[PDB]
Structures are given as C-alpha cells and as structure tokens.
C-alpha cells in the first residue's frame, strides 16, 4: 500500500484502460481481448521464468505441491489492496491474472503479435477503437510486470537497494516507447495493412525462435562460457540481486535489425564493434 501511495504515475496507468468510447460497445471486445492476453501471457512469462538462475525467482516457485494455489491468493490480496484506494481498473487486471493462474506449466514482440492476431481474427473503418485498445493492451503488459514484482517477501533487505520507486521509471520508459511506436507506424490505418503487419510480425517471431534454438544448439561446443547459474550460497546472490536492481534501467526496449552480422579482420582496438551491448564495463585481471 505504501509504495503505491508514494508515487506519481499510478493514476495515469489507471486512466489508460477502456474509455467508454462514445455510446459504443463499451470495451466488451476489449474485455475479451485483455482477458485473452492475461490468459496467454501468463503461460508466456511463466515459461520465460522457467529457465532462470536462482535469486531471480520467488519462494513460491520452488515448492512442489500447491504451487498454483498460492499465486491465486497473492493476486487476490493485490487486487483487494488496489481496490482499497480508488483504482477499480487495476484490480480487474489482478483478478484476471489470478483467474488465469491455473495453467502454469523479446516480450513486446509476442505482445504485438498476439494483439494483431486476435484483432484481425475477430474483425474477419473505425480507427479510434484500435488506438485505445492498443494503448490499453500495451499498458496492461507493463502492469502485469509491475504487479508480479510486488513480491519476493525477503524480510526487509530486498527493498533497500537504491530505488524502491521503480513504478515511475517503468512508466516513463514504456510511455516514451509507446508514444514513438504509435506515432511512427500505426497511422493512416485501414483494413489492408493489419494483415500485412500480422504477417511480418509472425515471420519475425518465427525468425526469432529459429535463431534462438540455433544459438542454443551452438553455444555448447564454444569456448565462451557465461555461467547462467552462478551460485546458490546465500551471500553472492544478494550481490547479484543488487546489481540487477541497480542496472535495471540502464537498458532499453529497442531491437536492432542487424545484430547477427559481424565485422571481420578487425584490429585490437576495433573489437568493441563486435560486442553489441549497452553499458559494457571493461574488466581486467
């Protein structure tokens, strides 16, 4: 409750979902679309969480039996707390994310793909509806993230890093990204280029998965090891948690079209051109 009263951009997240259009359908199709996205993105982010090191997961992930029954109650508590203040549109999202906790057996790609997919499948030209539903969908994704981050129940130590107000930072980042994305491409929109965007989005995701499994089958014989599971000792995991929290907002959501092409016959001072990294510290021994 306190980390929510102590912020500035929660009302903006609240006002972003499902405006009563004029007299119109009143976001019924939006209700369906958001529920579908909760349903699928639950499995999506859970299987993303499946292959992780320690120190990056909640204690509600290691216990064997009754693992999908605790998340239900935690999300119900979060929805009660959001309702308690005034935010009746942020509690519905947690109700959805608690209903969709049964099936628990790089991301914006899947978000836009699913949005375009379901929208074109349902409407097979009003252009405002598209914009408000796209805004609601994209903000709902970041809301999923931030809602799941109100956890880890580490007595006091997890919340004392240096930020503790991550909601405003995440809101600013995603607001800039979505403003750019909406202004540049999704304009002059009619019922011809939705199918196009859907085709290229599906092709792009297929390329992403193909290269993912390829580099997964390629990374083993190389002599370039990155640990991916460092330690389970309860003194180095805190270092890594603090490092992730600090350097979280030193990254961006932008993707590049040529990131598997490399320079050849470099010198010793031209190696940095092959790193493809942001905030790259140089380490010596």
């Amino acid at each position: 409750l306190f980390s929510t009263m102590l912020s500035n951009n929660v009302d903006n997240l609240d006002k972003a979902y499902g405006l009563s259009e004029n007299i119109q359908v009143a976001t019924s199709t939006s209700a369906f679309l958001t529920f579908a996205y909760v349903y699928n993105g639950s499995i999506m982010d859970s299987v993303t969480n499946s292959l992780l090191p320690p120190y990056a997961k909640k204690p509600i992930t290691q216990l064997k039996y009754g693992k999908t029954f605790v998340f239900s109650n935690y999300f119900m508590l979060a929805s009660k707390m959001y309702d308690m203040l005034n935010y009746k549109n942020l509690s519905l999202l947690c109700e959805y994310q608690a209903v969709a906790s049964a099936n628990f057996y790089l991301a914006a790609e899947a978000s836009k793909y699913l949005f375009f997919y379901f929208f074109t499948n349902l409407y097979l030209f009003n252009r405002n509806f598209f914009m408000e539903l796209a805004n609601g969908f994209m903000y709902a994704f970041c809301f999923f993230a931030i809602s799941q981050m109100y956890a880890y129940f580490e007595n006091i130590n997890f919340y004392i890093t240096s930020n503790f107000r991550f909601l405003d930072r995440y809101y600013g980042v995603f607001n800039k990204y979505f403003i750019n994305y909406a202004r540049i491409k999704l304009k002059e929109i009619t019922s011809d280029l939705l199918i196009k965007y859907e085709r290229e989005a599906y092709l792009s995701m297929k390329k992403y998965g193909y290269l993912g499994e390829v580099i997964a089958a390629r990374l083993s014989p190389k002599d370039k090891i990155m640990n991916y599971v460092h330690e389970t000792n309860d003194d180095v995991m805190s270092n890594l948690r603090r490092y992730d929290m600090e350097n979280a907002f030193k990254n961006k959501m932008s993707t590049y079209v040529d990131d598997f092409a490399f320079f050849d016959d470099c010198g010793k001072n031209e190696q940095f051109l092959n790193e493809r990294c942001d905030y790259c510290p140089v380490i010596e021994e």
């Binding site: 204690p59 509600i60 290691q62 216990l63 064997k64 039996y65 009754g66 605790v70 508590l77 009660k80 129940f153 580490e154 007595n155």
Partner: peptide, 16 residues
Amino acid sequence: ADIFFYKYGIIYGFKV
C-alpha cells in the same frame, strides 16, 4: 505460505 527455507506447504488462513 511459510517459506522464507521450506519445500512443502505451511499454509495458514487470515482475513484483512
């Protein structure tokens, strides 16, 4: 719950 380390459930019940 009651974990933080247990590997099984220590579920209890409360209301706010």
